[PDB]
Short mmCIF file of C-alpha atoms (C1' of nucleotides) in Angstrom, two decimals:
data_model
loop_
_atom_site.label_atom_id
_atom_site.label_comp_id
_atom_site.label_asym_id
_atom_site.label_seq_id
_atom_site.Cartn_x
_atom_site.Cartn_y
_atom_site.Cartn_z
CA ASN T 1 105.45 138.55 51.43
CA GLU T 2 104.51 134.94 51.25
CA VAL T 3 102.06 135.71 48.69
CA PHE T 4 104.27 138.19 46.04
CA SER T 5 107.96 137.54 47.18
CA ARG T 6 109.10 134.81 49.15
CA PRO T 7 112.64 135.22 49.78
CA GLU T 8 113.50 131.53 47.82
CA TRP T 9 112.73 132.90 45.01
CA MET T 10 115.41 135.75 44.49
CA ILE T 11 117.39 132.21 43.44
CA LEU T 12 116.60 130.97 40.10
CA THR T 13 115.10 127.73 39.40
CA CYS T 14 113.42 128.36 36.29
CA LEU T 15 114.23 131.15 33.93
CA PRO T 16 111.08 132.98 31.93
CA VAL T 17 112.14 133.65 28.35
CA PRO T 18 110.95 136.53 27.11
CA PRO T 19 108.71 136.51 23.19
CA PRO T 20 110.19 137.36 20.42
CA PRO T 21 108.38 141.42 20.88
CA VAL T 22 111.05 141.56 23.71
CA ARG T 23 114.00 140.69 21.71
CA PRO T 24 112.90 141.48 18.06
CA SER T 25 114.98 140.16 14.85
CA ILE T 26 116.05 143.01 12.87
CA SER T 27 115.39 140.71 9.70
CA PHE T 28 117.41 143.04 7.08
CA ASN T 29 116.49 141.45 3.25
CA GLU T 30 115.00 137.67 3.22
CA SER T 31 117.93 134.98 3.76
CA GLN T 32 119.99 136.64 6.48
CA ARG T 33 118.41 136.68 9.98
CA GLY T 34 119.61 140.30 12.51
CA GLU T 35 118.75 138.35 16.11
CA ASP T 36 118.37 140.50 19.29
CA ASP T 37 121.09 140.48 21.91
CA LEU T 38 119.56 139.29 24.37
CA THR T 39 118.50 136.19 21.83
CA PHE T 40 122.19 135.56 21.71
CA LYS T 41 122.37 135.91 25.47
CA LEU T 42 119.76 133.66 26.15
CA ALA T 43 121.73 131.34 23.74
CA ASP T 44 124.55 131.60 25.85
CA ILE T 45 122.04 130.51 28.95
CA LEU T 46 120.90 127.89 27.49
CA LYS T 47 124.39 125.94 25.57
CA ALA T 48 125.71 126.83 29.46
CA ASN T 49 122.66 124.91 30.74
CA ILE T 50 123.26 121.99 28.62
CA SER T 51 127.41 121.64 29.56
CA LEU T 52 125.86 121.62 33.11
CA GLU T 53 122.95 119.22 32.67
CA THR T 54 124.76 116.93 30.58
CA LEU T 55 127.80 116.79 32.84
CA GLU T 56 126.21 116.06 36.40
CA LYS K 1 108.24 211.30 2.71
CA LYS K 2 111.70 211.79 4.31
CA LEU K 3 112.78 209.58 7.47
CA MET K 4 112.78 212.18 10.81
CA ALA K 5 115.96 209.60 11.58
CA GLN K 6 118.99 209.50 9.01
CA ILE K 7 119.88 205.82 8.73
CA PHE K 8 123.25 204.54 9.33
CA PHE K 9 124.11 203.58 5.77
CA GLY K 10 127.06 201.44 4.06
CA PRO K 11 128.33 197.95 2.70
CA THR K 12 129.31 195.72 5.63
CA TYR K 13 130.21 192.06 4.70
CA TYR K 14 127.56 189.58 5.16
CA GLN K 15 128.58 185.76 5.12
CA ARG K 16 125.74 182.88 3.96
CA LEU K 17 125.43 180.48 6.62
CA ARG K 18 125.46 176.28 6.41
CA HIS K 19 121.89 176.44 8.01
CA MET K 20 118.74 176.89 5.49
CA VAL K 21 114.96 177.03 6.53
CA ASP K 22 114.26 174.52 3.78
CA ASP K 23 116.34 171.76 5.17
CA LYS K 24 114.59 172.52 8.67
CA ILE K 25 111.40 172.38 8.37
CA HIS K 26 109.59 168.96 9.59
CA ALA K 27 105.62 167.78 9.88
CA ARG K 28 104.70 164.61 10.76
CA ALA K 29 101.03 163.75 11.24
CA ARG K 30 101.52 159.72 11.15
CA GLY K 31 104.00 157.73 9.97
CA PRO K 32 107.01 155.43 10.70
CA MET K 33 107.29 153.26 13.90
CA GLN K 34 110.15 151.46 15.95
CA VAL K 35 110.00 147.65 15.45
CA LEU K 36 110.98 147.37 19.24
CA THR K 37 109.39 149.99 20.72
CA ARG K 38 106.69 150.38 18.60
CA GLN K 39 106.64 154.47 18.93
CA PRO K 40 107.41 156.65 16.40
CA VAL K 41 110.86 156.76 13.96
CA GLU K 42 114.13 159.76 14.81
CA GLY K 43 114.55 162.38 12.61
CA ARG K 44 113.25 164.49 9.61
CA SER K 45 115.27 162.29 6.61
CA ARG K 46 113.07 159.17 8.37
CA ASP K 47 110.04 160.91 8.62
CA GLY K 48 110.30 161.03 12.04
CA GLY K 49 108.13 162.35 14.81
"C1'" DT O 1 133.95 150.68 70.88
"C1'" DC O 2 134.79 154.05 66.85
"C1'" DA O 3 138.13 157.42 63.47
"C1'" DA O 4 139.11 156.71 58.48
"C1'" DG O 5 139.86 155.03 54.27
"C1'" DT O 6 137.97 151.46 51.66
"C1'" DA O 7 134.15 149.83 48.15
"C1'" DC O 8 131.35 151.80 44.58
"C1'" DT O 9 127.55 154.44 43.65
"C1'" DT O 10 125.40 158.43 40.63
"C1'" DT O 11 124.33 162.73 37.75
"C1'" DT O 12 124.86 166.38 34.06
"C1'" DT O 13 119.13 171.88 29.00
"C1'" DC O 14 116.91 170.74 24.04
"C1'" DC O 15 117.51 169.81 18.98
"C1'" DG O 16 123.12 164.55 11.15
"C1'" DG O 17 126.75 160.08 9.12
"C1'" A V 1 130.36 166.57 13.76
"C1'" G V 2 127.01 171.30 14.51
"C1'" G V 3 122.43 174.12 15.74
"C1'" A V 4 119.34 177.73 20.10
"C1'" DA D 1 131.56 166.70 42.87
"C1'" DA D 2 129.96 164.89 45.90
"C1'" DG D 3 128.11 161.68 48.65
"C1'" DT D 4 126.15 156.04 50.91
"C1'" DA D 5 126.95 152.16 52.54
"C1'" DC D 6 130.95 148.96 54.10
"C1'" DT D 7 135.09 147.51 56.74
"C1'" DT D 8 139.42 148.28 58.89
"C1'" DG D 9 143.04 148.59 62.65
"C1'" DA D 10 143.35 151.63 67.31
#
DNA sequence: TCAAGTACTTTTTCCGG
RNA sequence: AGGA
DNA sequence: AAGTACTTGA
């Protein structure tokens, strides 16, 4: 459908970053993080992206 | 007054089992919520729903 | 062109460490 | 690890 | 525990 689902959209150019409510940090005590899996997997993506960006 | 029925009466070895009502009993009416789903927590211990 | 194996998919009642 |  | 879909040789 030309409005909501063009085929070119199954290929990701710009990636939506979900907000903290989706990937909340299980913040045990004060000075100790506890970041969500998705928070880490995004960092991986972000890191993988910067290697490629600088590389090219 | 005597029972019209005669009762089968005598000793029998009976065991006390692990499961006691007061350890089972639970009630909640608002309380702790999950962080992710913002829904009630799990289990009697945690004061779950 | 079509039988047969291939990839590969998916579920399974309810409620303490 | 158990309970119906 | 039984399928859907896809690919392989006659």
